[PDB]
Amino acid sequence: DILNEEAKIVQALNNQRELTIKMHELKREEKDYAHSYSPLFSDPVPQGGSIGKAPGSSR
Amino acid sequence: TAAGISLTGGRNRCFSEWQSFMHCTAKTDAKSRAQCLPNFEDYMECLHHTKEKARLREIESVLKQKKEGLEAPPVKVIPVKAIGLV
Structure with a gap:
């Protein structure tokens, strides 16, 4: 009845550790132009x- | 902003290469920009004319040594009161 109450806490700390690894990987993930800058006017x-203006300027 | 507005309200002398490069970056995932590089090199040479300067330096370097000078249809200079004289 104490080994189980440790397994609960160690699961509760490994969950927080995986939470950190995720939220530290989610920072360095590259982001769209519509999320990072102006949402409408996405181009x-x-x-x-x-x-x-002169016709023939587009490319 | 005033991104590509000219002196007369139109477009810059280098707007087409820039708009081409922004087409390039619009369709390109980040860290895949190495394929986007030649449009950029075209744009920087539109701004500063660097490769054109080096090329004309090499043409003038071969031209200026020769004693013959020029055997070609020449470039005639005129004074401003004689644009359409003849």
Whole structure:
């Protein structure tokens, strides 16, 4: 009745250890442009500066 | 912001290469950017004209030593009051 109450605590600490390893791997995971920056306007693509614009500028 | 707005409100002299590079980075997962590199090299040379400068230095270096100089259809300079004289 005491070896079991230790197995409970050691499971409760190994769970916290795996919780840390996860949440330390979830930081270094690379992130989308829609989560990291502006959620709508999800493209990085400009079309910047359209008043005297020339056809053939897109690529 | 004022990303690619020109002096006259249009686009920069290097907007196309930049928009090409942003197409490249938009479709590229992070840490896969090594395939994205040639669009970038094109953009930096659009900005600063470095490879073009080195190439014209080598052409002028072979040109300037010769005693013949120039055997080609030449480039004629004019004064400003004589654009369409002849």
